[PDB]
Design a protein around this ligand. Structure first.
Ligand SMILES: *C(=O)N1C[C@](N)(O)CC[C@H]1C(=O)NC1CCNCC1
Length: 263
């Protein structure tokens, strides 16, 4: 597979495994490398979490507008938004933006509670036709990234297919699809991943994940090239040793090869 050779060289230099899926929604063209292998989700579940909350918000009138009045017991390390609004509370919409754009852990856990926990998010992903996605822990308990553990994993292909359904397809009603897209476009944590691979003129929405252990980190994105239909892509990494370091540069490099390989 000549298309695959640069991805194999990249993951060999990195000391692990890289999984890539990219789909051009204009051509139908794809690039695939280990696309159906499982990789840890890490914080990247929070994008799908926000989409599941938007889906619920379609039939639960005013759900997104609902103030959640949480206590200190709800706070988690790296909850910089939730900690700031601890007096006044946050709406479900504000919690969703914090979870997506800052990876706020308390916000992610409050939204998981809205859905019936990790099992509720998994059930939402099954409802849109994703059979690969698995989540069974709350933050910060889903991040062990142990090689061969299928818990708290998905595949680059399933992530890309689900992201397309939610951001571009019909899995959400249009006003909810639009809110999901705007949350992803405002992500603050992905500047060195897929965003570093795309021409500066192209709009990007993304969500990152970083377990760090076992060289584990990821990003998925919708990309709007000038004058073209969007591209959806996912890049996930892992490595065999607990102290193997993740690399943002390797994720950006894999994203460039994906864009270069599209027909
Ligand atoms: C998400 O992937 N994520 C990283 C972690 N190591 O798994 C811990 C939980 C979560 C997180 O808190 N990310 C923050 C992103 C912004 N800087 C602080 C960490």
């Amino acid at each position: 597979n000549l298309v695959a050779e640069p991805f194999a060289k990249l993951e060999q230099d990195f000391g692990g495994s890289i999984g890539v899926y990219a789909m051009d929604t204009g051509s139908g063209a794809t690039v695939s490398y280990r696309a159906e292998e499982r990789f840890p989700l890490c914080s990247s579940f929070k994008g799908f979490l926000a989409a599941a909350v938007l889906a619920r918000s379609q039939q639960q009138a005013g759900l997104l507008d609902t103030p959640i009045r949480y206590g200190k017991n709800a706070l988690v390390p790296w909850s910089p938004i939730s900690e700031k609004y601890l007096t006044t509370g946050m709406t479900v919409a504000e919690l969703s933006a914090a979870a997506v754009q800052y990876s706020d852990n308390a916000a992610a856990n409050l939204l998981l509670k809205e859905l019936g926990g990790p099992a509720g998010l998994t059930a939402f992903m099954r409802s849109i036709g994703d059979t690969t996605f698995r989540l069974d822990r709350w933050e910060l308990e889903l991040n062990s990234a142990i090689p061969g553990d299928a818990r708290n994993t998905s595949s680059p292909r399933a992530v890309t297919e689900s992201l397309q359904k939610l951001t571009l397809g019909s899995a959400l009603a249009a006003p909810q699809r639009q809110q999901f897209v705007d949350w992803l476009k405002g992500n603050t944590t992905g500047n060195h991943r897929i965003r570093a691979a795309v021409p500066a003129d192209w709009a990007v929405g993304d969500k990152t994940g970083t377990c760090g252990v076992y060289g584990t980190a990821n990003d998925y994105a919708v990309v709007w090239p000038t004058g073209r239909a969007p591209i959806v892509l996912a890049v996930y990494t892992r490595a065999p040793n607990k102290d193997d370091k993740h690399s943002e540069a390797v994720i950006a490099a894999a994203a460039r090869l994906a864009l270069e390989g599209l027909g």
